[PDB]
Nucleic acid binder design. Structure first.
Lengths: 842, 58
RNA sequence: GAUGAUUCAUAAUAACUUUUCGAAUCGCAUGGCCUUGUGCUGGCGAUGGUUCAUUCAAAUUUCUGCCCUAUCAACUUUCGAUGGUAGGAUAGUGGCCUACCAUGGUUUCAACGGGUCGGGUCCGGAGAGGGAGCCUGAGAAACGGCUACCACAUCCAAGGAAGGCAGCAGGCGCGCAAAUUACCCAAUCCUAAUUCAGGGAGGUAGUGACAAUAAAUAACGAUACAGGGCCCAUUCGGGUCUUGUAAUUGGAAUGAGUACAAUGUAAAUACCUUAACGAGGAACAAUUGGAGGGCAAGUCUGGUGCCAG
RNA sequence: AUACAGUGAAACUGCGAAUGGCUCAUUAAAUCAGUUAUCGUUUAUUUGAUAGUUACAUGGUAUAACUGUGGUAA
């Protein structure tokens, strides 16, 4: 009989008493045999804890099958404790890929079988399901995984490295665990390994303020119906306050008022909204609208509305009636609730697109506003009471500063509400905080006063510097503070950001990090951060190595995409680089920092400026300068972005040329993806020109198919950007050909020409040139008309839109803010020029 | 059975009393005295290749 | 040729067949010849195969066969009844079923209806989620299998998966009570590519005042000390003589038991036999029932002391 | 034992599993007891009889067991 180290029982008991979760890392082949004992220490600690256990594994379980019937048969062909546990307890087994299924359920435990396959999303997705007083176990059984730990302890600098993935995320995890006060690293013999941060854990004395502040609130409002019944349902002080604020908005009755509710996942927003919706019902609000990307997501909200209805004394089938959808796609989701108490009141679901119906709306509730395109939500912001809920780091969600970007747009009276306390466990649980440091999820951009005192640096003075990934991710205090700052700049600028990208920027070799630092004269504060990935022949060697492993790693989108559209073998060979992300601080937006950085970036790989690996079984400088490291030989620079006028304006000014536009708008943004290229000086450029003309011909025909939503001015821009590509080519080899008389004859009959002249003479009516406009737009924007015919931007937009995007003329009047009659007038002026042009040819 | 020993674990009063290359690595790691954070404190990081070693963030 | 009796047996002719069958098999031995080639010719079995008969059976089928009955006189014909013809099917006869035709069939000698497991441990008869349809086999409408269905119910990662014995024992049915979920195929039989494999067929053992048979729990002396003991009789009384011990004491006999064993048995228990130990309170301490006494500084109750209950 | 020769897991073939055991709800010539026929039938097996009408040996038109790669919670 062996006595367990007093640290293990003390920490578990401390967590249960404080309702704080803890981490254990077990190293050893027999580690599984320790898992049974550890749980029993819980159930001894508290019997009220949830018994369900989450088991996550990659492909295989460790030496057992989860099929009972087999397990008896395997036994057939006395037990150890281990199988006793797998028998009696409720264990839910999970493939790492299918982490989405687990997002809702609660578990006393999560067991992470395979450390090497750990990912940020999977790690974030598992732990938050653990309840207060719960425990997280990570099983470090792999011999190599043991090797790294030993190297880490002997020295914090030298990194063990096996024979392309650097896997850097796995060790920063290790060092971060050592920082955690509630993490213990242990062997299969229950010996507390001193690498843990939980070294001086002492048993707390035997036995929360938030419940006191929540309890007291409930009695004080008990007499105040309908508030008392509704506030009773609240689980946290913030949740009650949010409900009270919603009631205040409901009482104010101001139809220019917007309420913004921001919280992390699991903080009970839908309960607050569902309760608030019930409050408006009892208050007397008649027409209720609710909108979400899909009605299926609103099931929780509708459920919590009915619980509020139960709290308010409303009864099903007498006071209110529930209507569910008949469409199989929404799976019988609730669409409408009709309420008959004291007058006809209606709660109905609407698709976000159908904003026209909201003219009669007295309130709309926008759930998960992060998931709806920005154009749609602004249309949804009508003259009525608005409740908006947006998730931060929940589901896909959106970047933090996008939530802010909505706020500065609101800067219509707006009310902001934030729910910080979780409803599942004690506030300030260490693991969530320890998560937060590692994944940098809650990093917040901070305005730097020093910039203001010395002023904003003029772009020329700013100098670009390369950043060493090894030294960044060494978990040094200085390095980390730089990580948060750059990550703060990361999450802000761009629309959407998943948690896995942190692993991507670190471990994948082709990814390189550039930052536009301010001129040197304290930890430097990034002004712009640039991350590049090398794609081309350079990546082929790594891909073949991935093929040898059997597990193809990543993808060359652009060698692939360009291959599919044009089937050019040369590009697959051509080495190049793609800017995954340009991050510039929104507050210093429009000062040209980004344009300066890409210019320096453009110069660096052109050679105008012409070992730091950590020891493999003192650290190199954090950042490296352009001269100090030789650039790779590159042929081109590429980019990914959804077509926005600001971005497309940003790119075109920086001499990139579009090559492809996706017909299918991305569902999550509603936006079409672009790939836009630029050829470096001294390297062959003709092939760019060949695609740009094709894409132009592609784009003009596809204007109406799916791009008809695009504005004509936006359309005119991208052709202009494509037209710049031929200007890059001084060569006279590839050229437009003017129309021959024979070709003109084929495209238009003589009767066609005669009627056109009538219009130039004003003798015939507009609609009778329905058909010829598109070809004419094809001919002119094909440049077939030649130097003879030219038009200004607005006229080109008008002709492009009618001919190719295919609107009626009146629609153009609104877009160009021109009254309809003049739009006809300019069009006729446009018509006369080519009616003239055809004549001289004749 | 709380008082009785179930499996191989027995608790009396507040004490739980249980039944039970890398091994060179665990015992050596078991002997580690100074913490990771204490190890970091002595180390300063050269931000710049030629710059001074910055130890603590302000 | 055969039978009491044949379109029976058997033979022949002409064709027919999605039509057969008439050893492309195995073990053991290696003889007799010669024309020395491993040339010819060969011994005993096994497993196969057509038809007939025999055996194992099955299926229909003839006549006879103890209840009260008319306060049960009509019963079938009301989806074949009685019969004939032809067809289908069956292993075949056959209203067994189909197409046409005839109007019949039982019955006051009791039809029809009503009331009340068989015969002699043996021979028979019947049945094992509900119902319907199929499956192989000589023998089944199989306690086996399959399809769809109606219910029950088990698991799941929720995507599916699968499930049906009072035979042997052991249980529930009360809140009140009863033999072991034992051992073996050694016997007698039964199935198989078979001496040898198996069989909860069976056998062996375990429990018990349901019943039935036999008998232990003592047998034999010596001494001492006293004079009453017993029978009949309502009555008074009468009649008879070796008795009593609530006394002491002696040496023999052996069973339950405990057991060296052997025997017994598939093995084992038990039975029988048999070394050593094994009795005076032979405390090695069977019961059940019935008829009477008598005793207190004791207690209760009615009275005509000292009584009566 | 230079085809193998021994026994022999597994698998393919052959035979059997309609025997035996158990309970009595039903039905008054219904089975049943005796009795008769099958010239009106089928019958594994047993037993006895019984077939003169490329070949010094054909094919996979063949695969199991077996080797090896996998999926599934099963």
């Amino acid at each position: 009989k062996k006595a367990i180290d007093s640290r293990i029982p003390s920490l578990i008991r401390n967590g249960v008493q404080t309702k704080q979760r803890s981490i254990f890392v077990i190293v050893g082949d027999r580690a599984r045999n320790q898992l049974p004992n550890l749980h029993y220490l819980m159930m001894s600690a508290d019997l009220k804890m949830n018994k369900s256990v989450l088991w996550a594994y990659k492909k295989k379980l460790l030496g057992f099958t989860s099929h009972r019937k087999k397990r008896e048969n395997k036994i057939k062909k006395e037990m150890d404790p281990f199988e006793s546990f797998i028998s009696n307890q409720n264990i839910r087994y999970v493939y790492y890929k299918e982490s989405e299924k687990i997002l809702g359920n609660t578990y006393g435990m999560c067991i992470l079988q395979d450390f090497e396959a750990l990912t940020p999303n999977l790690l974030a997705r598992t732990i938050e399901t653990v309840e207060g007083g719960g425990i997280v176990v990570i099983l470090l059984k792999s011999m190599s995984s043991l090797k790294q730990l030993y190297t880490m302890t002997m020295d914090v600098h030298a990194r063990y490295r096996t024979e392309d993935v650097v896997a850097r995320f796995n060790e920063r995890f290790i060092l971060s665990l050592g920082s955690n006060p509630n993490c213990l690293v242990v062997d299969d013999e229950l010996n507390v390994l001193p690498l843990s941060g939980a070294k001086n854990v002492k048993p707390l004395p035997p036995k929360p303020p938030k419940q006191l502040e929540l309890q007291e609130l409930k009695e004080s409002l008990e007499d105040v119906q309908p508030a008392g019944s509704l506030v009773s349902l609240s689980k946290t002080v913030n949740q009650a306050h949010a409900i009270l604020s919603f009631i205040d908005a409901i009482s104010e009755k101001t139809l220019n008022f917007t309420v913004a509710l921001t919280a992390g996942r699991g903080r009970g927003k839908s309960a607050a909204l569902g309760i608030s919706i019930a409050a408006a019902v009892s208050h007397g609000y008649s027409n209720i609208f609710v909108t979400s990307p899909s009605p299926e997501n609103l099931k929780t909200l509708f459920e919590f509305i009915f619980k509020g209805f139960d709290a308010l004394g409303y009864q099903e089938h007498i006071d209110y009636d529930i209507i569910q959808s008949t469409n199989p796609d929404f799976n019988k989701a609730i669409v409408r609730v009709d309420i008959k108490r004291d007058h006809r009141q209606t709660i109905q679901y609407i698709v976000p697109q159908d904003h026209q119906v909201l003219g009669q709306a007295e309130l709309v509730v926008i759930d998960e506003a992060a998931a709806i395109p920005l154009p749609i939500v602004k249309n949804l912001l009508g003259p009525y009471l608005v409740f908006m809920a947006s998730t931060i780091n929940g589901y896909e969600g959106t970047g933090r500063s996008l939530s802010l970007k909505l706020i500065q747009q609101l800067r219509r009276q707006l009310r902001e509400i934030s729910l910080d306390e979780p409803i599942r466990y004690a506030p300030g649980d260490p693991i969530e905080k320890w998560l937060n440091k590692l994944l940098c999820l809650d990093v917040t951009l901070i305005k730097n006063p020093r910039f203001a005192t010395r002023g904003t640096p003029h772009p020329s003075q700013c100098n670009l510097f390369v950043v060493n990934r090894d030294t960044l991710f060494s978990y040094h205090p200085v390095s980390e503070n730089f990580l948060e700052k750059m990550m703060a700049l990361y999450v802000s600028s761009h629309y959407k950001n998943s948690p896995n990208d942190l692993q991507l920027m670190s471990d994948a070799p082709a990814h390189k990090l550039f930052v536009l630092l301010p001129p040197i004269d304290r930890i430097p504060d990034p002004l712009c951060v640039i991350q590049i990935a090398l794609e081309g022949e350079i990546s082929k060697e790594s891909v073949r190595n991935s093929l040898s492993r059997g597990q193809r790693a990543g993808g060359d989108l652009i060698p692939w995409l360009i291959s599919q559209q044009f089937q050019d073998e040369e590009f697959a060979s051509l080495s190049g680089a793609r800017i995954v992300r340009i991050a510039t601080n929104p507050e210093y937006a429009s000062m040209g920092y980004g344009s300066r950085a890409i210019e320096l970036l453009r110069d660096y790989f052109e050679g105008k400026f012409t070992d730091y690996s950590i020891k493999r079984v003192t650290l190199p400088p954090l950042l490296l300068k352009l001269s100090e490291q030789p650039p790779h030989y590159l042929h081109y620079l590429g980019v990914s972005y959804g077509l926005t006028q600001s971005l497309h304006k940003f790119w075109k000014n920086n001499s990139f040329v579009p090559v492809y536009l996706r017909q299918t708008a991305n569902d999550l943004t509603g936006e079409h993806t672009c790939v836009m290229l630029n050829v470096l000086e001294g390297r062959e450029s003709n092939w760019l020109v060949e695609f740009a003309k094709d894409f132009r011909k592609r784009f003009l025909s596809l204007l109406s198919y799916d791009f008809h939503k695009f504005t004509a001015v936006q359309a005119l821009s991208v052709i202009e950007s494509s037209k710049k590509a031929q200007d890059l080519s001084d060569d006279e080899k590839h050229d437009n050909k003017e129309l021959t008389r024979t070709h003109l004859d084929d495209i238009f009959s003589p009767f066609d020409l005669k009627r056109l002249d009538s219009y130039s003479n004003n003798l015939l009516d507009y609609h009778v040139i329905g058909d010829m406009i598109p070809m004419l737009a094809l001919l002119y924007f094909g440049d077939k008309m030649g130097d003879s015919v030219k038009l200004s931007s607005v006229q080109s937009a008008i002709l492009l839109a009618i001919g190719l995007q295919r609107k009626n003329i009146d629609t153009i009047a609104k877009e160009l803010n021109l009254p309809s009659n003049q739009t006809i007038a300019m069009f006729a002026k446009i018509m006369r020029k080519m009616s003239q042009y055809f004549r001289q040819l004749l | 059975a709380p008082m009785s020993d179930v499996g191989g674990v027995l608790m009396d009063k507040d004490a739980v009393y249980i039944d039970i290359e890398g091994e060179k690595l665990m015992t050596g790691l078991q002997s580690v005295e100074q913490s990771i954070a204490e190890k970091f404190d002595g180390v300063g990081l050269q931000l710049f290749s030629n710059g001074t070693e910055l130890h603590e963030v302000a």
